[PDB]
Design a protein around this ligand. Structure first.
Ligand code: MN
Ligand code: MN
Ligand code: ZN
Ligand code: ZN
Lengths: 343, 589, 55
DNA sequence: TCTGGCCTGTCTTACACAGTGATGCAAATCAAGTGTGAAGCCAGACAAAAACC
DNA sequence: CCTGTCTTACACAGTGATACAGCCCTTAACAAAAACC
DNA sequence: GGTTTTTGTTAAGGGCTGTATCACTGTGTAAGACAGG
């Protein structure tokens, strides 16, 4: 190739100035593109620019969690890629565990003003026993269930921090300020369902919340700075309590959920101050328990089973009445009326 | 270089036309290569060059297949990973799915060409043959016998071809390692293990049979010497048991088993009479095959060699003894069964040429009451030797605690109290939990001299302490033989003396342990006392997951349809067993 | 920088002037650390949290 | 035909063990410095180890 | 006529393989923006 | 304002790319006929 080498040195000294490295790289890249072979060209470009292909521990955590890879399987892939390219593209398992600590409840500090009634002020609280200290001695009622849950507030903290990037970008997109700290309001959807049979060859219940929308108070206007795009996707139904129990076993259901209802009730009466992007912000919460199918609504709002003549969970009608009177009914039931009527 | 693409193109277009001319003149128009040489020479003139050539920093598609198959990633999951890593580092670290499929074509049967001289009898000569229907054209009309199974298989020879090409790198490097020439093409000899087992229940809420072959060793003929250029290091690993036929059927369903397996037996029998020529490293090589069917547990051997079920009186699959005979004559038996003898004896049974009663006939044909259809090499494994010995020692311990050598008669209560005594004492002094059913590691832990000391702490007479210590010493003198991987090299004196030690063992049992004869004896004991040396000279050696493998592939890597799921599982299993990929998963070494 | 790293940077002048053609500062740091390096840990904590702020 | 003990066989309880995320300690590793060396590349006329008439 | 429990039924989640939508590239020949004097 | 580079356009089709799409079942869920009081 010496002859074309001397000819190219001539052409380069003619006008280019002798940095052949670059001109031979450009000639070869443009030839590769001419052969519609873009991939190899881009890889050469990245290797000549030297931009490092190292995935931050959080990206590896994302990939492992979203492809259901076990620690052992992820470790084999990690070690094999590292060994064969010599470069540590994926991070080792401990870096992932440490990146997980950030995304889980209990990592960030916060405060409640005023302090939450009957809720611990500790902020390092993580996974907690779902039984919430339920007596398990042979004398007391038998406990046949296992359950794990978060502290409801701790979960709300971690979730808000998880969508911090979307909150800031939504304020920007509404022409509002990044560091503005006015009273944000979060509408929180509560969901509960039994997951049917879980046995491998036994039922489960999932108590969850979805962050529905976050508004800010700017004047006498409530500017919508975030709204959940896919409100019924498993991607944003955030789990709060997982229990192995039957949605029809009333005793265990109330024993496991009452702690959560107390925490929630206590958060209805306070404002959460939490540090985002350097700026302390305040959050008010609106809890709307809407993610209850008919059967679970009737069980947890003291109504009769769905076969009864009292067909509406929203009104006092009877099957016969609602068949004779088609249209004219108003929404009249409410948690308070129902508590009263039990009395 | 700060310029854009149309700019760089226009600013260099004159040199571009000049170089295209210069390339068409003599190079032939592979401008890519001349520019690669130009840029590499430029880079050297001024590390980055080596990585550019590698694109190091780009994983070869076979490495991506290895990672993907070996981590059980679905295609969709693999793609999400690929696109996310690419999008975040800007570089194409993993290759896209079509590259993995294209690399998959190479490692699967049907890709490389070969020839059989002479051509294999009753086997098609096409070499592009991959996964084929395992029923092998079995009639499926409603009139015919009902087909409740689905099966997919390779053509046996095609599979062996793919296997040898998968291990080419190891074969060449083994020839180098033996001080031989890479290009030597003399007659290689491949010793191949055949294995068959049922994988129990596969149901997700249905049994399967797995027919496989393992490459055991490859020797070359260089002079009057057979030079071992390859030997499987881990012969009992799922990593090298290569799948050949997967069927959804019961190993006890003789009709479906024979219908699905007879085609494979025909292909193997025809490979017994030929030489495979196959091109490795540029040089055509010749291969002869020796098929040894050893991966058959007792039940499948008795089924495929026309013998009776395991409850029979003819306990040995290797000899004509009876349970009563093998309990009276402990040691002196030779291996006398062979596939041909069994075929003959079936014909004798079916024709009954001397007009005998059914009892007399069964005695004549020694329990061969069905027609064999697979020639096997039935053996035993290190496990069952320890097991048979432990069961006998445990019963001896019980009966030495009750002094049966002194008291002939005992009620069932007295025997249960002896066993309870021994169980409590072993729990107390040895920290061995009592077990209600025999098992491997229990045997492993009980057959020690320390436990003999412990149990002697419960026996009054010390002459029987001497008896037990000697008996266990003989057990420990024999054990290395059946447990080692190569007794010839690892304990030659133990092996030389094995026959003598088992003779003295049986004589001890027959003199100082008269009470422990009741006319019964186990397959494992009889084999352990009578056939261990002959088996070592036949095979060289003696020394629960396959179901999970099948299930996992079925769930996470298989189209959910009855005719493709089987071949999707078979393809993934083959990819899993390919050494070429396992080497990438052992790169860090 | 480690305590010993700031130490070695500070006393490369002495060992180089004494001997013009690492090992001597290595030894001295050795035998005196087995036996006042507090400001090196101070600076290390400062630079550590500074890099921590760096996102 | 009929109760009793042996028989092939289908059922049962049993017990190792495969793998999970977490754990904990050993061993790299990284980071500034500064005196070294080192494996491959630089040009041009021209002739051998390795293959075409 | 009922409250309620079992029954079978019917969409749908995802498997690997595969058709489909598509921006980049080629020829040559122009011209608008840009940037130095 | 001139003059050179940088960048863009036009067209008609081609090529690797990323993706919606394919056919395809088992499986969980819930409609609901029916059982039991
Ligand atoms: Mn429900
Ligand atoms: Mn078996
Ligand atoms: Zn209503
Ligand atoms: Zn025998």
């Amino acid at each position: 190739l010496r002859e074309l080498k001397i000819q190219v040195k001539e052409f380069a000294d003619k006008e280019e100035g002798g940095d052949v490295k670059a001109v031979c790289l450009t000639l070869f890249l443009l030839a590769l593109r001419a052969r519609n072979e873009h991939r190899q060209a881009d890889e050469l470009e990245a290797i000549m620019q030297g931009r490092g292909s190292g995935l931050q521990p959080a990206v590896c955590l994302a990939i492992r969690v979203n492809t259901f890879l076990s620690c052992s399987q992820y470790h084999k892939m990690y070690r094999t890629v590292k060994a064969i390219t010599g470069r540590q593209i994926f991070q080792p398992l401990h870096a992932l565990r440490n990146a997980e600590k950030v995304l889980l409840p209990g990592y960030h500090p916060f405060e409640w003003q005023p302090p939450l009634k009957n809720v611990s002020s500790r902020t390092d609280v993580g996974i907690i026993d779902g039984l919430s200290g339920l007596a398990s001695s042979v004398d007391e009622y038998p406990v046949d269930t296992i359950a794990k849950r978060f502290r409801y507030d701790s979960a709300l903290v971690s979730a808000l921090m998880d969508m911090e990037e979307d909150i800031l970008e939504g304020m920007r997109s509404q022409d509002l300020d990044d560091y503005l700290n006015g009273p944000f309001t979060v509408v929180v959807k509560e969901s509960c369902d039994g997951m049917g049979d879980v046995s491998e060859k036994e039922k489960a219940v999932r108590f969850s919340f979805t962050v529905m929308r976050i508004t800010i108070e700017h004047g006498s206007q409530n500017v919508k700075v975030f709204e959940e795009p896919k409100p019924n996707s498993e991607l944003c139904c955030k789990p709060l309590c997982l229990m192995l129990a039957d949605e029809s076993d009333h005793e265990t259901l109330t024993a496991i959920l009452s702690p959560l209802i107390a925490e929630r009730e206590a958060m209805k009466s306070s404002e959460l101050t939490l540090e985002m992007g350097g700026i302390p912000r305040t959050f008010k919460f609106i809890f709307r328990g809407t993610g209850y199918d008919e059967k679970l609504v009737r069980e947890v709002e003291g109504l009769e089973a769905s076969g009864s003549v009292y067909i509406c969970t929203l009104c006092d009608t009877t099957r016969l009445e609602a068949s004779q009177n088609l249209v004219f009914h108003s929404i009249t039931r409410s948690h308070a009326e129902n508590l009263q009527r039990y009395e | 270089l700060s310029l854009t693409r149309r700019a760089q193109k226009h600013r260099l277009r004159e040199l571009k036309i000049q170089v295209k001319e210069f390339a068409d003149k003599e190079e032939g128009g592979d401008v890519k290569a001349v520019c690669l040489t130009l840029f590499l020479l430029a880079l050297r003139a001024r590390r980055q060059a080596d990585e550019l050539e590698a694109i190091g920093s780009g994983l070869q598609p076979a490495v991506c297949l290895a990672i993907r198959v070996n981590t059980f990633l679905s295609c969709s999951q693999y793609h999400k990973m690929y696109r996310t890593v690419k999008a975040i580092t800007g570089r194409q670290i993993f290759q896209p799915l079509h590259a993995l499929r294209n690399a998959e074509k190479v490692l699967l049967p049907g890709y490389h060409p070969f020839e059989w001289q002479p051509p294999l009898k009753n086997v098609s000569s096409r070499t592009d043959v991959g996964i084929i229907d395992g029923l092998s054209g079995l009639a499926s009309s409603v009139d015919e016998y009902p087909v409740d199974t689905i099966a997919k298989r390779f053509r046996y020879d095609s599979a062996l071809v793919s296997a040898l090409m998968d291990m080419e790198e190891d074969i060449l490097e083994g020839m180098r390692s033996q001080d031989l020439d890479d290009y030597l093409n003399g007659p290689f000899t491949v010793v191949v293990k055949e294995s068959c087992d049922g994988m129990g229940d596969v149901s997700e809420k249905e049994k399967a049979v797995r027919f496989s072959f393992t490459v055991m060793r490859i020797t070359i003929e260089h002079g009057s010497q057979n030079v071992k250029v390859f030997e499987e290091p881990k012969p009992n690993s799922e990593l090298c048991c290569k799948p050949l036929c997967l069927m959804l059927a019961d190993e006890s369903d003789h009709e479906t088993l024979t219908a699905i397996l007879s085609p494979l037996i025909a292909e193997r029998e025809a490979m017994k009479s030929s030489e495979l020529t196959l091109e490795m490293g540029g040089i055509p090589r010749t291969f002869k095959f020796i098929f040894r069917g050893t991966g058959y547990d007792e039940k499948l051997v008795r089924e495929v060699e026309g013998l009776e079920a395991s409850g029979s009186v003819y306990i040995c699959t290797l000899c004509d003894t009876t349970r009563l005979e093998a309990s009276q004559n402990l040691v002196f038996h030779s291996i006398t069964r062979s596939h041909a003898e069994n075929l003959q004896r079936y014909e004798v049974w079916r024709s009954n040429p001397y007009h005998e009663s059914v009892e007399e006939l069964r005695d004549r044909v020694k329990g061969v009451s069905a027609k064999p259809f697979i020639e096997t090499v039935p053996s035993i494994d290190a496990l069952h030797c320890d097991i048979g010995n432990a069961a006998e020692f445990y019963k001896i311990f019980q009966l030495e605690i009750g002094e049966v050598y002194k008291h002939p008669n005992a009620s069932k209560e007295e025997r249960k109290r002896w066993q309870a005594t021994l169980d409590k004492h072993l729990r107390k002094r040895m920290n061995l939990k009592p077990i209600m059913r025999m098992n491997g590691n229990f045997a492993r832990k009980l057959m020690t001299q320390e436990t003999v000391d412990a149990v002697c702490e419960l026996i009054p007479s010390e002459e029987r302490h001497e008896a037990l210590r000697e008996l266990m010493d003989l057990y420990l003198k024999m054990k290395p033989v059946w447990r080692s991987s190569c007794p010839a090299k690892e304990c030659p004196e133990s092996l030389c003396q094995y026959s003598f030690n088992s003779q003295r063992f049986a004589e001890l049992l027959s003199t100082k342990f008269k009470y422990r004869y009741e006319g019964k004896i186990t397959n494992y004991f009889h084999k352990t006392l009578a056939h261990v040396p002959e088996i070592i000279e036949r095979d060289g050696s003696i020394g629960q997951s396959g179901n999970k493998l099948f299930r996992r592939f079925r769930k996470m890597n298989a189209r959910q349809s009855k005719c493709y799921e089987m071949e999707d599982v078979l393809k993934h299993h083959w990819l899993y067993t390919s050494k070429y990929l396992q080497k990438f998963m052992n790169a860090h070494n | 920088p480690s305590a010993f790293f700031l130490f070695c940077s500070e006393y490369r002048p002495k060992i180089k002037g004494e001997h013009p053609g690492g090992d001597v500062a290595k030894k001295l740091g050795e035998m005196w650390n087995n036996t006042d390096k507090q400001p090196y840990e101070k600076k290390a904590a400062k630079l550590k949290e500074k890099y921590e702020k760096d996102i």
